[PDB]
């Protein structure tokens, strides 16, 4: 339990946020690898 | 048939052969990339599953709910990959429903949705698409796990089905259990493990779910690319065989046409 | 037996480093090749890997899992683990100050908690850098 | 030497030509439906 947990934020969202922060921390030289790791391909069917 | 029909069919089959060979080369390149990317993913998945490998984490008894994760792609022409995973998920659904357990299925591949929607339409929980068009990555798996938790289906017991890559020609449709429930995570082995708590173990289990989803996605994409290459190669071979047969037929028809027209001309000249 | 690898890159596989410190969600922990088996959730921070040899390694990691079993096999799984050099200290400070500025922007408790995750990650990044 | 050209699959009028025509029609019917929905939503404005 923390400020994020038990307040509407899933731990997966926590991981996404910290991973995005780390990727943004990377310089533009290594930004291509960060974009490669970032997966936005999967969409939703409902 | 006539000369024109043979020519049309032969040209169409030639074009089909060229397209199949080009797709075979494309699938070979994608298979090489997936094979390169699989090794870190393989290590990551083995590490994620190591905790449950070294602990006898087994479901105690019957559970009302059960989620089945059928990992597949949207593209076709993959041979029996989607067929095998669909057969496996159907068998598992029937077996678990025979015990009176509520069965829900999540399919990351539109092909799985199409195959199972004729019968298992209601059991679909959340369907995903655009899988296999680009190499899978941990972001997509994280999104899938996030919406799986957000779906509101608190499955006490879970499992995942995917086609594990064994070799360039061989693959195995493997089933891996998922103990996403916090209570089922706690067992006799967790007594030895320190700082287990409840929330920490819950977050760890969610992250392990994301990790196994990512590992299954990588294995499935490697298997799909290998099978795509093999199927395109077989299609190209069949097209080439048909091409040579039709070429022989076309030569026979061309010679027959020439002979017939010359015979008509000669008969007309002689009857004059 | 240290198993450290991101979803994309591999750092250590069965390495006998015998000393690893992880930024756990609850705090900090130290592996000593005999540490009590436990499962630890990673927190925005840096994993300073201390090999058996005198040399050490410093990698800033995202959230993840620290799985140390009864044996020495530790499977450290970090979502975004990179060395400190690839990062930018100036961009680090800029992101930290912008996130501090935008912390109050998110009226929702969950969204403000998310921005708090952001500021915490940036603060750990600043301390590492 | 006998050769081929571009767009010879539909010229033969075999199974593959009809398959391609049906696939194109089914895809573009959905695309036309989506475009009509978007145009109606725009025209409501």
TrEMBL record, chain A:
Domain of life: Eukaryota
Subcellular location: Mitochondrion inner membrane
Family statement drawn from the similarity comment of this UniProt entry: Belongs to the eukaryotic ATPase epsilon family.
Protein name from the UniProt record: ATP synthase F1 subunit epsilon
Residues of the full protein shown: 87 to 132 of 136
UniProtKB/TrEMBL annotation, chain B:
Membrane-topology annotation of the record: Peripheral membrane protein
Pfam families named in the record: ATP-synt
Main location: mitochondrion
Alphabetical keyword list: Acetylation, ATP synthesis, CF(1), Hydrogen ion transport, Ion transport, Membrane, Mitochondrion, Mitochondrion inner membrane, Phosphoprotein, Transport
Any one GO molecular function term: proton-transporting ATP synthase activity, rotational mechanism
InterPro entries: ATP_synth_F1_ATPase_gsu, ATP_synth_F1_gsu, ATP_synth_F1_gsu_CS
Highest taxon of source: Eukaryota
Entry's Gene Ontology cellular component terms: mitochondrial inner membrane; proton-transporting ATP synthase complex
CDD domains: F1-ATPase_gamma (cd12151)
Subcellular location: Mitochondrion inner membrane
Stated family: Belongs to the ATPase gamma chain family.
Protein function: Subunit gamma, of the mitochondrial membrane ATP synthase complex (F(1)F(0) ATP synthase or Complex V) that produces ATP from ADP in the presence of a proton gradient across the membrane which is generated by electron transport complexes of the respiratory chain. ATP synthase complex consist of a soluble F(1) head domain - the catalytic core - and a membrane F(1) domain - the membrane proton channel. These two domains are linked by a central stalk rotating inside the F(1) region and a stationary peripheral stalk.
Subunit-level organization: F-type ATPases have 2 components, CF(1) - the catalytic core - and CF(0) - the membrane proton channel. CF(1) and CF(0) have multiple subunits.
NCBIfam families noted in UniProt: ATPsyn_F1gamma
Identification of the protein by name: ATP synthase subunit gamma
Organism: Sus scrofa
Lineage, uppermost ranks: Eukaryota, Metazoa, Chordata, Craniata, Vertebrata
From TrEMBL, chain C:
Keyword set includes Ubl conjugation: no
Keywords, alphabetical: Acetylation, ATP synthesis, CF(1), Hydrogen ion transport, Ion transport, Membrane, Mitochondrion, Mitochondrion inner membrane, Transit peptide, Transport
Location of the ATP synthase F1 complex delta/epsilon subunit N-terminal domain: 1-81
Domain named F1F0-ATP synthase delta subunit C-terminal: residues: 87-128
Primary subcellular site in the record, as a coarse category: mitochondrion
Location of this chain's protein in the cell: Mitochondrion inner membrane
GO CC entries: mitochondrial inner membrane; proton-transporting ATP synthase complex
Molecular-function annotations in GO: proton-transporting ATP synthase activity, rotational mechanism
Assigned protein family: Belongs to the ATPase epsilon chain family.
Quaternary organization: Component of the ATP synthase complex composed at least of ATP5F1A/subunit alpha, ATP5F1B/subunit beta, ATP5MC1/subunit c (homooctomer), MT-ATP6/subunit a, MT-ATP8/subunit 8, ATP5ME/subunit e, ATP5MF/subunit f, ATP5MG/subunit g, ATP5MK/subunit k, ATP5MJ/subunit j, ATP5F1C/subunit gamma, ATP5F1D/subunit delta, ATP5F1E/subunit epsilon, ATP5PF/subunit F6, ATP5PB/subunit b, ATP5PD/subunit d, ATP5PO/subunit OSCP.
Purpose of the protein: Subunit delta, of the mitochondrial membrane ATP synthase complex (F(1)F(0) ATP synthase or Complex V) that produces ATP from ADP in the presence of a proton gradient across the membrane which is generated by electron transport complexes of the respiratory chain. ATP synthase complex consist of a soluble F(1) head domain - the catalytic core - and a membrane F(1) domain - the membrane proton channel. These two domains are linked by a central stalk rotating inside the F(1) region and a stationary peripheral stalk.
Name of the featured protein: ATP synthase F(1) complex subunit delta, mitochondrial
Source organism phylogeny: Eukaryota, Metazoa, Chordata, Craniata, Vertebrata
This protein's encoding gene: ATP5F1D
């Amino acid at each position: 339990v923390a400020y994020w947990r038990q307040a509407g934020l899933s731990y997966i969202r926590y991981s996404q946020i910290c991973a995005k922060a780390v990727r943004d921390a990377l310089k533009a030289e290594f930004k291509a690898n960060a974009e490669k790791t970032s997966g936005s391909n999967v969409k939703i069917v409902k | 048939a006539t000369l024109k029909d043979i020519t049309r069919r032969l040209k169409s089959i030639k074009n089909i052969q060229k397209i199949t060979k080009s797709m075979k080369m494309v699938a070979a390149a994608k298979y090489a990339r997936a094979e390169r990317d699989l090794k870190p993913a393989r290590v990551y998945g083995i590490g994620s599953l190591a905790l449950y490998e070294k602990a006898d984490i087994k479901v105690p008894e019957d559970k009302k709910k059960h989620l089945i994760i059928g990992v597949s792609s949207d593209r076709g022409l993959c041979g029996a990959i989607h067929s095998s995973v669909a057969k496996q998920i159907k068998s598992e659904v029937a077996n678990l429903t025979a015990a009176g357990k509520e069965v829900k299925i999540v399919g990351v591949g539109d092909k799985i949705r199409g195959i199972l929607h004729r019968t298992h339409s209601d059991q679909f929980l959340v369907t995903f698409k655009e899988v296999g068009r680009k190499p899978p990555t941990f972001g997509d798996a994280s999104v899938i796990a996030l919406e799986l938790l957000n779906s509101g289906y608190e499955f006490d017991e879970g499992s995942i089905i995917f086609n594990r890559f064994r070799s360039v020609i061989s693959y195995k449709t493997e089933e891996k259990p998922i103990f996403s429930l916090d209570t089922v995570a706690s067992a006799e082995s967790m007594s030895i493990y320190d700082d287990i708590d409840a929330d920490v173990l819950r977050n760890y289990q969610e992250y392990s779910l994301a990790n196994i989803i990512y590992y299954s996605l990588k294995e499935s994409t490697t298997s799909e690319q290998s099978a795509r290459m093999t199927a395109m190669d077989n299609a190209s071979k069949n097209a080439s065989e048909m091409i040579d047969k039709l070429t022989l037929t076309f030569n026979r028809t061309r010679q027959a046409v020439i002979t017939k027209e010359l015979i008509e001309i000669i008969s007309g000249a002689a009857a004059l | 037996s240290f198993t450290f690898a991101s979803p994309t890159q591999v750092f250590f596989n069965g390495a006998n480093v015998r000393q690893v410190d992880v930024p756990t969600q609850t705090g900090a922990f130290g592996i000593l090749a005999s540490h009590v088996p436990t499962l630890q959730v990673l927190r925005p921070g840096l994993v300073v890997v201390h090999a058996e040899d005198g040399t050490t390694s410093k990698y800033f990691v995202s959230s993840g899992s620290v799985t140390v079993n009864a044996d020495s096999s530790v499977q450290l799984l970090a979502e975004e683990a990179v060395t400190l050099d690839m990062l930018d200290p100036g961009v680090a400070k800029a992101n930290l100050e912008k996130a501090q500025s935008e912390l109050l922007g998110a009226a929702d408790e969950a969204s403000r908690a998310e921005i708090q995750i952001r500021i915490e990650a940036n603060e750990a990044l600043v301390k590492a850098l | 030497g006998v050769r081929s050209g571009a767009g010879a699959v539909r010229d033969a009028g075999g199974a593959f030509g009809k398959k391609e025509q049906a696939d194109e029609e089914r895809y573009f019917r959905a695309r036309a439906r989506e475009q009509l929905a978007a145009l109606k939503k725009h025209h409501e404005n």
